[PDB]
Design a protein around this ligand. Structure first.
Ligand SMILES: CCCCCCCCCCCCCCCCCC(=O)OC[C@H](CO[C@@H]1O[C@H](CO[C@H]2O[C@H](CO)[C@H](O)[C@H](O)[C@H]2O)[C@H](O)[C@H](O)[C@H]1O)OC(=O)CCCCCCCCCCCCCCCCC
Ligand code: CLA
Ligand code: CLA
Ligand code: CLA
Ligand code: CLA
Ligand code: CLA
Ligand code: CLA
Ligand code: CLA
Ligand code: CLA
Ligand SMILES: CC1=C(/C=C/C(C)=C/C=C/C(C)=C/C=C/C=C(C)/C=C/C=C(C)/C=C/C2=C(C)CCCC2(C)C)C(C)(C)CCC1
Ligand code: SF4
Ligand SMILES: [Ca+2]
Lengths: 74, 154, 74, 733, 80, 143, 30, 42
């Protein structure tokens, strides 16, 4: 729970891309305030949304992570 | 052909997979220089992909609507290389392993401490027994007819 | 021995000299796999003309902070 | 006695809270109660059966009442494919205004739940048309539940309680069940179909007021006593016929068309009436086999005694099996649960492939819910069949009266049976997993062409044997020359071949390599679950580790840490371990069924045929993808009618994970913790004026396994039921 | 309370009595075995059911048997 | 013939500051136990309920909540130190019941004045099948 | 209108009476 | 020396050497004959 808190907080309120004029858009659109106050929000707006990369990594250089995901489940 | 399948040499999806795979590797190739080491690596992977697809289409592999080789294990003589022939090869190897290990356990069962030669391998005894599995279907078959393979009343 | 392996991989199978010139675009990588059973797909485009596995240990940042530049020092 | 439980003195004299739990968990175990006799045993069982029948009648009565009161049945009959049936009405004072808004559907005034049991299609197909008909059936079943309780109470006073000899009258019971309970009921059901259902399916509303005036057939009854029964099959309904109307209607009452009604996509109502009539009269003749009070018939004892092969390969055959089963109610319940679980799975496999209720094949949520329901029901029933088989071996098996028959010989080579079940489970598990991992690695490295996709050619050959053309193996029914095809062209083969090759229904769906891998996972699940239950049932009376297990009963914690450790060594623990494998097996079965249909209903069978061959496809293209509308049942921006499933979805995840606590953590930790809590209460002011009258103790080891299994199973069922219905009804297709 | 029984396969090694943590077992004189002594369970009201005695029996099969029966305050190990 | 020693109150108790593992309401309304021993000197000994206590020189009396606590402390008194010990049970009425050592001889040492209780005269595997005791209040091992 | 009477009668009053009566019977002595 | 050879015959070391030789052999076989879903030599 600690590391999931860290991940979602950094991807929602800090990490992102900054414009030339100073417009910062975070990796997730500041969804931490409204989505993380709910267990269903943690299930949907965190796990279901951010597991896309690992369930789509087949056929790329990140496919080893897609294999380790399921092997660790096993 | 069989089960509605079409041979991979005739399937368009099979050839489209080979095209799209090679073109995807070529898309990775344009990023690097023609004399580069990643270039020779990607070129070797492309040649390896062509060899794989050509070999699958040449040996009579059947393809589904997905353009992927489907195997037929019913025993049809047109596809014995897909299961029965490699399966006989496996059963030869598996019987070899089991027969040699069995010969080892029989040879050490009369030792003072049989557990000693099970956690510390007697490599000389092993090296002398590893080649008895070469004729395992014979030595086993004879032990079947002579009542030596199965322990009586267990 | 583990640290020896780390510095040696930074020297022999890495793109540290390329990450040193463009640290914001290059992905740090210090492991390159052999091409045997198609696992060379894991040697992904990491920038600087390098195909490898992106590393997250942070040895590039440490070696830059210490002042290391050439593969010889590693 | 002296206090609860009045049937167990040792539980009543328990000074701890354990008295209450074990009093509840052992209420129906009549054989363990104090001062039990064979008479009281059979009599309590008899009255419990009546109480169960009363429960079932009351339950169905309530279902009719709500469908007729708050439901859509009258409106649903007019638009069977455009009206969402209503289960009941919702009255929750915790609802916000939007919850009332989003849950008001199906054309109702208040919030309602959309029924997914299929009773609307069932009742419309059998002749019920108005809410008044449903009220009539509810009153009749409420009255039937009343007389069930009446008979249950009746046979509990002296001179009405029967002797144990009457319960042990097996010959008479089989004759009546086959003749009356099975045959006469099916015969009368064929009567209802040809009087009310078939004419109701042709526009004629036949009820108790006018059923004496209408003729089920223009030339009724006459031909039945002549032998020219074919006149009842002369004028069927046209293939262009509407169910509630008469355009295309005929006059036949007993046909063998073989296909489906093109409009409703359900079996021909005349075929079903003829079916029940044929199997009924087959049950009627078959119900005259055994001997009663008339000097003719068989002695089941003598039949079992005579079946002994010379040469002694089965020893003494079946000698003594008659009294062995007729004296053991656990043996009889094991056979009953085994046969019931098989035909329950049979019902599941046939209701989705051969829908018999009108306009139920298009209600995809209903088909998925019904198949999942019965498969989990059958899975539990099968675990119970083997559980009571082990209970029979401990409580009722007499080794001397079963000397050297087939039953004792099962124990004689228990190691052979258990070892080979282990080999088959190992073989299936090793290879099925290996092939799945191989294909996973291939698709990881971006080389799909290197997968191992084996064609399920044996089942494809069977589907071609039934007349399916998709594989073109040119065997009977699929080949023009085979006598199996020529003999049936006159009767069922036109409609049968017309239905099997229709690409919309699920009558023998097209199978590929993905179906080959899943069916072997099914074989792994069946073999391993069988292995667990059989090893527990055969090692229930004793093992090399505990040669006197029969003395310790069926359910005990363990035998101590001695001799290496004996945790989970009872046959009850074998059942407890097998339920996890049952849930896993039925999980594989239902994941399979739901994905194939949810891709079929979406018209995208290629995604299943290409993604079911590797397990990352199951995680990504089945669970993750279909959970979208479900998990968005309520979001930071609002909610819709799927929120009740998003909540139950998480609810099932909680109960399931709560069971892990009872299954991972064990007792001694919690006992010492409760001791530290008892000290806390005795030393706290004000509160120490309140004294507990039962000493707080940690849950028993066996109780912990049961509580953990129940949380696991409840979370299992509720999580999947929430996802199943929300992902299917959210699209409705 | 839990039931405890001693079978005549006992050899009289007095190990069940040494391992017992609530003084339930005794060693009485007997004529069946070599040590001239067999075990008995005269105080099963104090028996807790730990089966520490069965863990120490060298007989095959066991000569001490602890059949867990009706739980009491003494058998549940309650100090409260 | 053996005569059990009567429990003498006002007997000194070991030096101890107090712990939370002591007696509860069970001692007040149900029962409690008391172990006594002699000891040669003032020593320290670990308490079966809490920490450490100072064993007084000469007669010692210690009241515990369970019987197993008494025998465990006695076994350590007999092993680490070389001290004989007895312990009794005390009902809320004031009645005292002598427990161990019952005969005055330790239970692991055979004594001629002892009678058999629950001793089956057959192999353990010679018990009957449960069906032969069904509908009776018997068990296959009670016989 | 009937749900406004029977829903509390089975979710509040019925479990209250049922749990209290079962408590008295379970804790009763003879 | 004899003790050193006896150590090399222990189960984990014999397993590593045996499985390393086995892993290298299968790697070279799939290096000279990559892919191959069938037995092509008939
Ligand atoms: C080319 C076309 C034509 C081909 C015709 C066929 C040719 C086949 C030729 C085979 C032999 C050629 C190489 C021989 C080299 C000498 C090896 C040896 O000392 O070969 C003989 C040895 C030992 O021979 C026998 O070996 C037996 C096995 O038991 C022993 O096993 C061990 C032996 O090391 C231990 O000593 C152990 O204590 C003991 O149990 C017994 O010792 C017998 O007494 C002994 O005579 O065996 C072994 O290593 C067997 C090793 C050879 C196996 C060949 C398999 C080929 C496939
Ligand atoms: C087992 C059948 C069954 C089931 C599962 C339900 C379920 C439900 N009923 Mg219902 N009911 C039933 C039979 C059933 N009913 C029968 C036979 C009648 C008489 C025709 C009614 C009349 C009725 C009314 C008027 C209302 C409900 C309502 C409800 C809902 C709210 C809960 C409630 O008020 O309790 C049920 C209340 C009752 C009075 C029914 C109990 C009386 C019957 C005879 C059952 C016998 C109970 C008996 C004392 C104990 C049964 C033992 C055990 C099986 C429980 C709920 C979904 C309310 C609703 O619509 O919610 C919005 C509501 O307004 N029911
Ligand atoms: C299954 C039946 C059931 C029913 C019918 C209700 C009904 C209700 N619940 Mg409740 N709830 C239930 C189960 C149930 N709950 C369960 C199982 C839980 C545990 C998860 C909860 C937890 C819960 C919480 C946390 C809250 C509610 C609240 C409410 C009220 C909100 C609606 C409102 O604003 O009314 C009117 C609101 C009022 C304050 C008027 C009160 C109604 C009068 C005073 C009732 C009189 C009581 C009567 C004298 C004695 C009753 C007991 C008796 C039968 C022995 C409502 C009357 C809310 C609430 O009570 O508001 C404070 C709220 O806070 N419920
Ligand atoms: C000489 C070794 C040997 C041999 C001949 C056998 C033979 C057999 N085993 Mg078996 N097994 C072995 C080792 C062996 N096993 C080991 C080490 C284990 C522990 C992992 C097992 C665990 C095991 C189980 C759980 C089961 C069997 C079963 C069986 C029987 C069915 C075939 C099978 O399923 O095999 C399958 C083989 C395995 C699952 C593991 C084998 C591992 C390797 C290949 C064998 C070891 C080789 C040895 C190290 C070589 C020594 C070299 C020597 C010359 C120095 C069969 C007669 C099944 C049975 O009961 O029959 C109905 C069954 O259920 N075995
Ligand atoms: C944390 C320690 C560590 C780890 C995890 C690795 C891991 C790895 N190294 Mg590496 N290495 C290390 C330390 C480490 N190394 C050190 C300290 C040095 C010397 C400075 C090297 C020098 C080195 C070289 C030159 C190469 C690798 C390579 C590799 C990769 C392939 C391994 C291999 O050769 O296959 C399997 C290994 C074998 C079949 C034989 C290994 C057994 C050796 C001889 C020791 C066993 C004998 C010993 C006495 C016991 C792999 C990811 C290779 C690579 O990156 O590929 C491009 C490669 O070329 N390493
Ligand atoms: C017609 C079928 C049938 C019949 C007549 C019996 C009859 C019997 N069974 Mg049996 N059983 C069956 C099917 C059947 N079983 C099936 C299908 C299974 C597989 C699950 C089992 C598994 C089983 C086991 C393991 C045991 C029995 C035992 C017994 C005997 C005593 C039962 C008892 O008194 O405990 C009372 C039962 C209860 C108090 C039920 C409480 C637990 C339930 C499941 C919790 C409810 C679930 C949940 C809380 C509700 C939903 C959640 C909610 C939020 C919606 C008894 C003669 C026991 C026995 O005596 O062994 C010798 C025994 O240990 N059965
Ligand atoms: C013709 C006379 C007759 C009849 C009709 C019956 C009928 C019945 N007896 Mg009975 N019995 C009889 C004579 C008879 N008996 C005699 C002479 C004796 C003395 C030997 C007994 C001794 C006896 C005992 C000891 C017991 C019974 C019991 C039962 C009941 C069984 C439970 C049940 O309802 O399942 C219903 C069965 C069916 C509906 C038919 C089979 C169902 C099939 C397999 C599946 C369903 C078919 C279809 C697909 C369903 C579609 C689903 C859809 C409708 C929703 C049943 C109503 C039990 C009982 O008393 O319960 C209270 C029981 O304990 N009988
Ligand atoms: C338990 C089932 C059952 C019952 C109670 C009835 C009852 C009845 N049927 Mg019916 N019927 C049934 C099944 C049943 N049927 C089935 C399965 C079929 C399909 C073959 C028919 C087809 C049928 C037709 C076509 C007609 C009836 C008619 C009738 C009525 C007059 C029958 C009569 O007196 O003939 C005489 C009785 C005997 C000759 C003695 C019978 C001896 C028994 C069978 C032994 C009557 C109320 C007739 C009617 O009046 O319409 C309402 C009529 O037209 N039935
Ligand atoms: C029981 C499960 C199972 C099975 C049947 C297979 C089968 C196969 N795998 Mg596979 N694999 C599996 C599990 C399995 N795998 C798992 C769990 C993983 C994850 C670790 C992998 C990862 C994997 C990879 C990465 C690759 C394969 C490949 C292959 C194919 C190569 C055949 C070959 O080596 O050429 C022939 C080899 C021989 C004939 C050796 C036998 C000769 C002996 C040594 C000597 C003969 C003496 C006479 C083959 C059909 C390769 C492939 O390209 O697929 C087409 C490949 O690259 N597999
Ligand atoms: C443990 C135990 C028990 C129990 C048991 C069980 C549980 C069993 C079972 C089982 C099962 C669960 C079975 C199943 C089965 C089935 C079968 C055996 C079948 C069949 C059939 C056939 C052969 C078919 C044929 C056909 C036809 C007819 C037509 C079409 C084609 C075909 C081919 C399909 C008891 C109590 C007894 C005793 C004690 C012990
Ligand atoms: S189970 Fe424990 S307390 Fe009971 S007699 Fe055996 S050793 Fe003594
Ligand atoms: Ca079809």
């Amino acid at each position: 729970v600690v590391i999931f808190h860290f991940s979602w907080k950094m991807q929602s309120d800090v990490w992102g891309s900054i414009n030339d004029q100073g417009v910062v858009t975070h990796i997730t659109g500041g969804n931490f305030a409204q989505s993380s106050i709910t267990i269903n929000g943690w299930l949907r707006d965190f796990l279901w949304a951010q597991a896309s990369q690992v369930i789509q990594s087949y056929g790329s250089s990140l496919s080893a992570y897609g294999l380790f995901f399921l092997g660790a489940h096993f | 052909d069989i089960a509605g399948l079409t041979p991979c040499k005739d399937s368009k999806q099979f050839a489209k997979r080979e095209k799209q795979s090679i073109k995807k590797l070529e898309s990775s190739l344009k990023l690097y220089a023609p004399d580069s080491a990643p270039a020779l690596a990607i070129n070797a992977t492309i040649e390896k992909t062509k060899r794989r697809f050509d070999n699958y289409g040449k040996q009579g592999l059947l393809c589904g609507a997905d353009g992927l080789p489907h195997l037929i294990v019913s025993g049809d003589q047109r596809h014995w290389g897909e299961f029965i022939t490699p399966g006989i090869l496996f059963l030869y190897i598996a019987g070899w392993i089991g027969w040699v290990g069995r010969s080892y356990l029989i040879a050490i069962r009369d030792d003072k401490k049989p557990t000693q030669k099970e956690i510390i391998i007697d490599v000389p005894l092993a090296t002398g027994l590893v080649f008895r599995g070469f004729s395992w279907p014979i030595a086993a078959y004879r032990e079947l007819l002579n009542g030596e393979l199965v322990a009586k009343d267990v | 021995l583990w640290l020896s392996g780390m510095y040696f991989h930074g020297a022999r199978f890495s793109n540290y000299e390329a990450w040193l010139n463009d640290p914001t675009h290059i992905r740090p990588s210090a492991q390159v796999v052999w091409p045997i059973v198609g696992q060379e797909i894991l040697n992904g485009d990491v920038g600087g003309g390098f195909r490898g596995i992106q590393i997250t240990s942070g040895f590039f940042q440490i070696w830059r902070a210490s002042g290391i530049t050439s593969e010889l020092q590693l | 006695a002296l206090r609860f439980p009045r049937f167990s003195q040792g539980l009543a004299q328990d000074p701890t809270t354990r008295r209450i739990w074990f009093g509840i968990a052992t209420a129906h175990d009549f054989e363990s109660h104090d001062d039990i006799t064979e008479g009281r045993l059979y009599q309590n069982i008899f009255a419990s059966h009546f109480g169960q029948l009363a429960i079932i009648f009351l339950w169905t009565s309530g279902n009719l009442f709500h469908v007729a009161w708050q439901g859509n049945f009258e409106a649903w009959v007019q638009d069977p494919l455009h009206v969402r049936p209503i289960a009941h009405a919702i009255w929750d004072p915790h609802f916000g205004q939007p919850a009332v808004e989003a849950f008001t559907r199906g054309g109702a005034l208040g919030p309602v739940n959309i029924a997914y049991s299929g009773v609307y299609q069932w009742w419309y197909t059998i002749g019920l048309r108005t809410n008044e008909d449903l009220y009539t059936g509810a009153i009749f079943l409420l009255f039937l539940s009343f007389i069930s309780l009446l008979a249950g109470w009746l046979h509990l006073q002296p001179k009405w309680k029967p002797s144990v000899s009457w319960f042990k009258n097996a010959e008479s019971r089989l004759n009546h069940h086959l003749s009356g309970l099975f045959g006469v009921s099916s015969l009368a059901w064929a009567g209802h179909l040809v009087h009310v259902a078939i004419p109701g399916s042709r526009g004629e509303y036949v009820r108790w007021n006018n059923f004496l005036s209408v003729l089920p057939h223009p030339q009724g009854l006459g031909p039945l006593f002549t032998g020219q029964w074919n006149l009842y099959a002369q004028n069927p309904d046209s293939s262009n016929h509407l169910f509630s109307t008469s355009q295309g209607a005929g006059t036949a009452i007993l046909t063998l068309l073989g296909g489906f009604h093109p409009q409703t996509q359900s079996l021909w109502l005349t075929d079903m009436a003829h079916h029940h009539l044929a199997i009924a009269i087959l049950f009627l003749i078959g119900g005259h086999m055994y001997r009663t009070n008339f000097g003719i018939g068989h002695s089941i004892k003598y039949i079992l005694e005579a079946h002994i092969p010379p040469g002694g390969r089965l020893g003494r055959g079946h000698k003594g099996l008659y009294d062995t089963i007729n004296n053991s109610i656990h043996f009889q319940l094991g056979l009953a649960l085994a046969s019931l679980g098989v035909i329950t799975s049979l019902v599941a496999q046939h209701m989705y492939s051969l829908p018999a209720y009108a306009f139920i094949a298009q209600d995809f949520t209903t088909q998925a819910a019904l198949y999942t329901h019965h498969q989990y029901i059958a899975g539990f029933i099968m675990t119970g069949a083997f559980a009571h088989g082990a209970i029979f071996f401990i409580r009722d098996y007499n080794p001397e009266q079963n000397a050297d028959n087939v039953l004792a010989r099962m124990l004689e080579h228990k190691e052979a049976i258990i070892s080979h079940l282990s080999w088959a489970s190992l073989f299936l598990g090793f290879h099925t997993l290996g092939l799945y991992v191989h294909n996973d690695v291939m698709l990881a490295f971006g080389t799909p062409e290197k997968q191992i996709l084996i064609e399920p050619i044996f089942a494809q050959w069977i589907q071609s044997a039934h007349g399916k053309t998709s594989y073109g193996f040119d065997v009977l029914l699929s080949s023009t020359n085979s006598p199996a095809l020529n003999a049936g062209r006159s009767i069922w083969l036109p409609g049968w071949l017309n239905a099997i090759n229709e690409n919309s229904n699920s009558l023998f769906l097209t199978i590929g390599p993905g179906d080959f891998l899943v069916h072997h996972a099914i074989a792994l699940g069946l073999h391993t679950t069988t292995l667990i239950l059989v090893k527990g049932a055969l090692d229930a009376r004793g093992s090399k580790l505990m040669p006197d297990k029969k003395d310790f009963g069926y359910s005990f914690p363990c035998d101590g840490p001695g001799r290496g450790g004996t945790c989970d060594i009872s046959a009850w623990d074998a059942f407890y371990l097998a339920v996890f494998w049952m849930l896993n097996t039925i999980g594989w079965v239902t994941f399979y069924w739901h994905w194939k249909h949810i891709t079929l209903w979406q018209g995208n069978v290629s995604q299943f045929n290409e993604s079911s061959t590797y397990l990352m496809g199951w995680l990504r293209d089945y669970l993750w993808l279909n959970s979208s509308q479900l998990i968005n049942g309520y979001n930071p921006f609002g909610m819709n009618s799927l929120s009740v499933w998003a909540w139950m979805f998480l609810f099932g995840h909680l109960v399931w994970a709560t069971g892990f606590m009872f299954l991972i953590s064990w007792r001694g930790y919690w006992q010492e913790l409760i001791e530290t809590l008892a000290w806390a209460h005795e030393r706290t002011p004000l509160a120490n004026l309140i004294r507990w009258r039962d000493k707080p103790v940690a849950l028993s080891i066996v109780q912990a396994r049961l509580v953990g299994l129940v949380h696991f199973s409840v979370g299992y069922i509720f999580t999947y039921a929430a996802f199943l219905i929300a992902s299917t009804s959210g699209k409705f297709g | 309370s839990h039931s405890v029984k001693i079978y005549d396969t006992c050899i009289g090694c007095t190990q069940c009595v040494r391992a017992c943590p609530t003084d339930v077992l005794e060693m009485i004189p007997w004529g069946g075995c070599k040590a001239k002594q067999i075990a008995s369970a005269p105080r099963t009201e104090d028996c807790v059911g730990c089966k520490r005695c069965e863990s120490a029996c060298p007989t095959d099969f066991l000569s001490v048997r602890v059949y867990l029966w009706h739980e009491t305050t003494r058998s549940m190990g309650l100090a409260y | 013939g053996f005569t059990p020693p009567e429990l003498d109150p006002n007997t000194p108790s070991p030096i101890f500051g107090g712990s939370t593992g002591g007696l509860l309401r069970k001692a007040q309304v149900e029962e409690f136990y008391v172990i006594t021993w002699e000891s040669p000197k003032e020593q320290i000994f670990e308490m079966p309920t809490g920490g450490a206590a100072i064993m007084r020189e000469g007669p010692n009396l210690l009241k515990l909540a369970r019987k197993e606590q008494c025998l465990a402390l006695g076994t350590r008194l007999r092993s680490k130190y070389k001290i004989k010990y007895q312990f009794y049970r005390v009902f809320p009425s004031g009645e005292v019941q002598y427990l161990h050592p019952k005969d005055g001889v330790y239970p692991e040492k055979v004594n001629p004045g002892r009678q058999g209780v629950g001793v089956n005269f057959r192999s353990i595997g010679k018990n009957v099948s449960p069906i032969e005791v069904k509908f009776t209040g018997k068990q296959p091992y009670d016989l | 209108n009937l749900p406004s009477l029977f829903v509390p009668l089975v979710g509040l009053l019925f479990p209250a009476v049922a749990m209290a009566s079962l408590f008295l019977h379970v804790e009763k002595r003879l | 020396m004899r003790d050193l050879k006896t150590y090399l015959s222990v189960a984990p070391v014999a397993s590593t050497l045996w499985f390393a030789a086995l892993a290298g052999l299968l790697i070279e076989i799939n290096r000279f004959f990559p892919d191959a879903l069938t037995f092509p030599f008939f």
